[PDB]
Amino acid sequence: NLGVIKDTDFDRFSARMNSDYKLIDDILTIGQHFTLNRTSEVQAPGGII
Amino acid sequence: GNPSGSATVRIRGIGTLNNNDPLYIIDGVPTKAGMHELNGNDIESIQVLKDAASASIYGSRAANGVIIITTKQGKKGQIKINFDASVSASMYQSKMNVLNTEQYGRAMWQAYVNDGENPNGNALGYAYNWGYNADGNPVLYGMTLSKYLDSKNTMPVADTDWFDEITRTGVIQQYNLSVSNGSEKGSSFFSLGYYKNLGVIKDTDFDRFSARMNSDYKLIDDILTIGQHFTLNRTSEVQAPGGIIETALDIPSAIPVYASDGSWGGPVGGWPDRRNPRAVLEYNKDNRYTYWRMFGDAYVNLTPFKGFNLRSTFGLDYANKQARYFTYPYQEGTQTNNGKSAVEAKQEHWTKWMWNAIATYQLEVGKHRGDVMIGMELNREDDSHFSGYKEDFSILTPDYMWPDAGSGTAQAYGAGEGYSLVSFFGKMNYSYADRYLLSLTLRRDGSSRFGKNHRYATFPSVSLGWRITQENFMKELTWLDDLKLRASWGQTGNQEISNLARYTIYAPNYGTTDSFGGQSYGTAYDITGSNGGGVLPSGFKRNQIGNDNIKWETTTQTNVGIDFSLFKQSLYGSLEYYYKKATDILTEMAGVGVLGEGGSRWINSGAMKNQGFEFNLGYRNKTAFGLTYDLNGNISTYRNEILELPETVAANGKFGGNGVKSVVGHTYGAQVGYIADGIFKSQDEVDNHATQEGAAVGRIRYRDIDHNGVIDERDQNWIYDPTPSFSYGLNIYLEYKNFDLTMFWQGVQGVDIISDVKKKSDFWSASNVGFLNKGTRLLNAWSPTNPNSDIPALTRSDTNNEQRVSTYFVENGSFLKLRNIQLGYTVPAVISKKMRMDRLRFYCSAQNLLTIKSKNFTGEDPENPNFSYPIPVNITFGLNIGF
Amino acid sequence: EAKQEHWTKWMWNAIATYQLEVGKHRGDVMIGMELNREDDSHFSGYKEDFSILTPDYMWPDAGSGTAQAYGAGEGYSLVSFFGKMNYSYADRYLLSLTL
Amino acid sequence: CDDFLDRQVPQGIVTGDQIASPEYVDNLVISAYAIWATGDDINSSFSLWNYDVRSDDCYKGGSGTEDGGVFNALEISKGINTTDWNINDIWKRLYQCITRANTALQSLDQMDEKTYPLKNQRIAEMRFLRGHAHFMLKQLFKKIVIVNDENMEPDAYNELSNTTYTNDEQWQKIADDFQFAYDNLPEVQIEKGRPAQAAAAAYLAKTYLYKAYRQDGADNALTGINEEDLKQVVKYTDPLIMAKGGYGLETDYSMNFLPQYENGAESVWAIQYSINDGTYNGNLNWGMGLTTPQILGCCDFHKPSQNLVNAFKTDSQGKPLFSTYDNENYEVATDNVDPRLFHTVGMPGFPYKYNEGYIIQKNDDWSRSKGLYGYYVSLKENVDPDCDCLKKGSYWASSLNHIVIRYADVLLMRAEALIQLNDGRITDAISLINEVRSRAAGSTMLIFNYKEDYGVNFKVTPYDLKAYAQDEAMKMLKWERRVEFGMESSRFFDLVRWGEAKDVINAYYVTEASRCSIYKNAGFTENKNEYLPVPFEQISASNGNYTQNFGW
């Protein structure tokens, strides 16, 4: 995203892994949820409008 | 025996003068740093590409060989789940023997009566009652200590065991868990982990958490396949300080670990300035760092028609490291840091990412198959760090000492680095009969540290091999099963040169940093004659000067190998021979004379060559006793030479001989020194010998080489080369009914080492400061009463120069030690299957249990004779639940 | 100024639910505990009076002027126990109690 | 994707292509200035302060006897090695300043005259600094390699020799940049750090007067003295160009060696040392980090000799005793002395830097060596301990702005020029040295209150207006240059300039063998020990392109 005010922006990368495994007639179940982001924002200054 | 378990790795012996760590590859994405923080249990196969014509494909940076690692995956139609564990114990075995208070007084008395000076006029609190025997030799009758250590009665005297004071038994824990999956269209895997180690030296540890997720999904009849590999670690290590074994050797044993009150004891007067090692370990307790780390992979597969794949991965390697290093005020007699408090709060960051797009082809017509593939590659490294500093804190605890609760001065640091790379490669294969194999590669590559004159570098390779048992003229040899010849010729060369090798660095250097002696190469220069006020102008001094013609360190390595297999698939093993020759080694040379400041130009000239043999073997056979054995083993051989070194860098001895002999012709790291062949046992040795400077009844003799009364510096020869022959290993596996035993043996024969505990344990005055504690071998030194020892006499001053490099400080470093032995016991079928599980195990093992050495070594550990972290004995009592 | 902040949370909980259906009545009772821990941080740096004015020369080692440093640290913890219940008795009259 | 490769820039540093940019100037000239203040070791000062202890005036100030070792070999002129390290250090430390000046000059090509009207002034300043360092190195070794071009690549710095230029050509190449500075320097600079027209005139006079004494061959012996350049010497020292700028004579001899006023009329071009100026401990004079005596804790180096003190003692007529002075111990309580004795050297029973609480005694607190070197302190480069001048960053250093060129220096060189010309204009040089003696006589206004509590008598009576003999006035001006320039590193170079140096040094050795214990075994050989030898490592690295000094 590149903002309407000059020289401010934002960009986000992401990922996600989800799974689960049920083993013995549904008496043992292991699962997980994971996320990983990276944002990089140049901030607008104070009182620019 | 560092709890992190880091390792110094060399492949095919020493290859280059500067840095030569190999290149690890974990699921496509490379990294040159780590593997003691990675989860070391999600391992599927470890290829090691020792060659250069087989490792030339992976990069220019594969001059030191690449270690290909892959991780696990989901099998088809299985849902298995394992659960490992271990609880261990670490015990200390390699304690160097030191002399306690009575032997210390006896050694001091012996030194003072070998001087002839009255021993009772010493600075320490000792009393000697002695006399003269009728045979002229002085005999010590009575020896009596004092009560306190100083006049003010602050420190009592005792007999403290330092290597028993900083050492504890350290427990070692371990856990694991692993779940798999797998169908005809997808697969998954998901691990966990924990590993906690508490070192044998007090107040050092290590612990690692981990995770792993792997999967892949194939969509439309295997024309679209997406997968991933991810890892996430967290290590947290408290580091041992610098020189804590040497400090535990140095301090005399009369010093107590505590004062009259609860404070630490110290050398209050006369005794030499050595800090209390228990205090050093008690203050380096909370310098804990924290290290996170991630991986990544996202490969996309696509087959347009048939037998023709595409690929596009994307790596990722992030890792940060947060620390907070404290310093404290201390007071032990005269040992005082002047009442200083500070805290430094470091932070480092790394980042890599790759991208590559290969495209392979596969055809099989007639009796010919081939595989051609092409693809490019990208890379980018973006490192960093910064820091902080504060001073003069009030309360002294690791949670009050954050940089906002301070009062004193402050500083700040920081830097930033970089790298880039872009390349193109290729490969080919051919068999034509299933007899004559052939493969050709070529990789064009250009980095971002190479000079402006040439960006892209080319690296060719030719490799061919052909079988024997498929030829029809060898069918009469029926007991043989397979025999394969192979030969190869490659050309690789790394690029681990400095990042500023082509840039002609200029730097500000205002002079805020400290320089002792008043050198202080600054750029301030107050003009207008103000003499005050911090508003001075600034300028630029030159740091160094770069050439534009820098270049990679190319190696051309050949290879000849022989395979075999016999006796209905037994006695398998290989036999290889190799000859590598690096041709452009970088040496930074100082600027001559009129160039002035900043003349350090990096040039590349120098050459090494290595050659040797490898021979592995393995015999697996079930006997009629009701037993099954397996004996793998290997024997290596290594030989080095430096071909040519350019300039006076060969003369002063940065690499080899200690400034007196050229290195060119000999091996790398070879030291050159005197030859010591015995003691002046008789009186007529003062004129049987030839013009010795220091000649007494001790004072080891040095042989003449010129035979001209030469005790000059023209009698040194090559006495020490650290490249041993005959390095070997052996793995032995046993299988009785319902039992299993695994043993191991590893060793090397014909090693020379340079011991520096021998200088501490054979001479009374060899180090700089006096009255240091020693090792208790010198108590049986040469005397008129005991003429039957090779240990020289105990003098108080270095009259004859005995601290020279000589053959007296060269031992036989050959050994053979058992690395581990492990006994297991598999629980049988129906008892395990009653609990709805597959496999159960209750094993026991112990590491580093014994060692055997030669006669020619008076020490404690033939691997590291010097003052490093010791090797402890582990004993493990673990299990292995497998569902 | 070269700031850096860090956060860290971790929880652990162990519920244990029950489920029964007899007659025309169903119910679901569950109990469990919970844990938490927050470990925040930050620190900083500062330098002054640089010579060249670009975002890559202005790292805190290429300066000349005065310097400062900052930093702090925070914390939190929690531990609890809970419960829940359900009831219908006819598929008409629903009821739930927590604590 | 070649554009992906050229996307990373090095961090935290400036590379070598934007360093030649026209906007990052007025930084390299200050950097080339700043190597004179900082950039010297405590064993090797840029005042040439340790390399003149062999000049009949210093006992080297040894705390121990052989704590320097090679310095004691240098002061005895016996057993000095070609592979010594002080020689290679002073060689490298002068060529570093040469390197900075050449880099500033090489950057100053790319400017214009449209927005930058100070190109000639900055080029003159950098050429002046380069010529000054080259003149100092020619004073040291006298067979050196001169780089003069600014656009010379580093690939051919190694392929340079010193035999390609003989001695008059070397002195002319030194005179080139000084004359170009005299072409384009302003008369008055507003800041006192930068040099002016008078400084360029004084250094042109120095270079020409050293060019006058001809050498003519590999032997370092005196030959027929050239008169041709003496017209340029007396042209480039005319007093109206020294009056322009206000550089004159101060009221007291104890004025310029006092830190409460630094820049005066005698300060032609000083070396600016400062304190509390943003950096770690201040740009202090770390070269004189050992000259402070045993009052502050260390290091009692550089104590003056007894022969200089006997050279201070005058008679009841107000004249120096012509070689009848060393026979008696010079004492203020017996006869008349010169008042600059109390300015230069502190005697036992006298205030240290005019501090009545620090009267000098002969105990251990003024000399670590008990009787091996005596009890003397130097006051030319030391201050009182109640200064803000002092700060102990492991060494006590002063912020006194050290002066290389004074008005008395250019006056006595003008006198030397007029007596060596000797074409009728002899008596005006006699009048000039009489003005200098009258200034020295009327300079006592600080220690003249010590006649009551101690008892002193001093008078410097000037001579009459008569053309004397040539050799008598030569000896008179040599005596005046010895008594004025004590402890200011200007004795050995004048002895080797006049040529008659070996005999007087051997006479000093045989008359000071009874004074010091180490001087019992001494010797100064002819044609070998005048200049310092070329260091062995530079000759070895040059692959024979360099050469060796004569007799080595």
Q: What is D136-195 written as a DSSP string? A: HHHHHTSS------SS--GGGSSS--STTS-HHHHHHHHHHHHHHHHHH--S--SSSSS-
Cβ-nearest to C62 among D9, D12, D278? D12
CB contact under 8 A, D277 and B532: yes
D285: closest chain B residue by CA: B518
What is the Cα–Cα distance from D483 to D313, expressed in whole angstroms? 10
CB contact under 8 A, D9 and C59: no
Per the annotation, binding residues of D for Mg(2+) are 53, 55, 262, 273, 399, 401, 519
CB contact under 8 A, C45 and B347: no
CB contact under 8 A, A19 and B294: no
Torsional class of D197: left (φ above 0), alpha (ψ -120 to 50), beta (otherwise): alpha
Tell which of D88, D96, D401 to mutate to test the B interface (max B CBs under 10 Å).
D96
Which residues on B lie below 8 Å from C44 (Cβ)?
388
CB contacts under 8 A, D 168-227 vs B, are 190-194
What is the Cα–Cα distance from B760 to B773, expressed in whole angstroms? 9
Per the annotation, binding residues of D are 53, 55, 262, 273, 399, 401, 519
What is the Cα–Cα distance from B646 to B650, expressed in whole angstroms? 7
- Strands B355-365, B347-352: pairing kind: unpaired
Which residues on D lie below 8 Å from B534 (Cβ)?
276-279
Q: How far is A48 from chain B (nearest CA, A)?
A: 31
Half-sphere exposure of C79 (CA within 13 A, CB side): 0
* Beta-sheet strands, E only, within B806-872: 811-812, 815-817, 820-824, 844-847, 851-853
Tell which of B190, B191, B835 to mutate to test the A interface (max A CBs under 10 Å).
B190
Q: Nearest CA to B174 among B203, B197, B198?
A: B197
Residue type present at position B313: T
Helix or strand run (H / E) with residue B29: strand B29-31
CB within 8 A of B317, min separation 6: which ones? B29, B31, B293, B294, B295, B296, B350, B351, B352, B353
CB contact under 8 A, A32 and B215: no
What does the H/E/C string look like for B636-648? ECCEEEEEECCCC
Start-to-end Cα distance in chain D: 62
Displacement of CA B568 from its chain's centroid (Å):
42
Burial class from Cβ neighbours inside 10 Å (0-12, 13-18, 19+) for residue B293 reads: buried
CB contact under 8 A, D14 and C64: no
Q: State the DSSP code for B591.
A: P
Beta-bridged to residue B180, according to DSSP, are B189
DSSP-derived 3-state class of residue B466: strand
What is the Cα–Cα distance from D452 to D443, expressed in whole angstroms? 19
| Whether B378 contacts B315, CB under 8 Å | no
CB within 8 A of A27, min separation 6: which ones? none
Which residues on A lie below 8 Å from B190 (Cβ)?
19, 21, 30, 32
Q: Nearest CA to B449 among B469, B475, B420, B470?
A: B420
The interaxial angle of helices D167-184 and D197-212, nearest 10 deg, is 160
Number of other CB atoms surrounding residue B401 within 10 Å: 23
In D193-352, which ranges are continuous DSSP H helix?
A: 197-212, 230-235, 239-243, 306-312, 340-344
* Beta-sheet strands, E only, within D275-401: 345-346, 377-378, 391-392, 396-397
* Beta-sheet strands, E only, within D389-516: 391-392, 396-397, 402-405
Q: What angle do CA B5, B10, B16 make, to 5 degrees?
A: 135
Which residues on A lie below 8 Å from B230 (Cβ)?
15, 17, 34, 36
Per the annotation, binding residues of B for Mg(2+) are 531, 704, 706, 708, 710, 712, 715
> What separation in angstroms does the CA of D538 have from each of B175, D236, D393, D535?
64, 37, 34, 6
CB contact under 8 A, A23 and B883: yes
Half-sphere exposure of D181 (CA within 13 A, CB side): 28
Across the B:C interface, residue pairs with CB atoms under 8 Å apart total 68
What is the Cα–Cα distance from B763 to B495, expressed in whole angstroms? 46
Which residues on D lie below 8 Å from B594 (Cβ)?
95, 98-99, 145, 147, 157, 160
What is the Cα–Cα distance from B481 to B565, expressed in whole angstroms? 6
Q: Establish if C57 touches chain D: CB-CB under 8 angstroms.
A: yes
Q: Establish if B593 touches chain D: CB-CB under 8 angstroms.
A: yes
Across the A:B interface, residue pairs with CB atoms under 8 Å apart total 37
What is the Cα–Cα distance from D372 to C70, expressed in whole angstroms? 56
Cβ-nearest to D12 among C57, C64, C65? C57
Number of other CB atoms surrounding residue B398 within 10 Å: 13
CB within 8 A of D17, min separation 6: which ones? none
* Beta-sheet strands, E only, within B495-624: 506-507, 541-542, 553-566, 570-582, 586-589, 601-604, 607-623
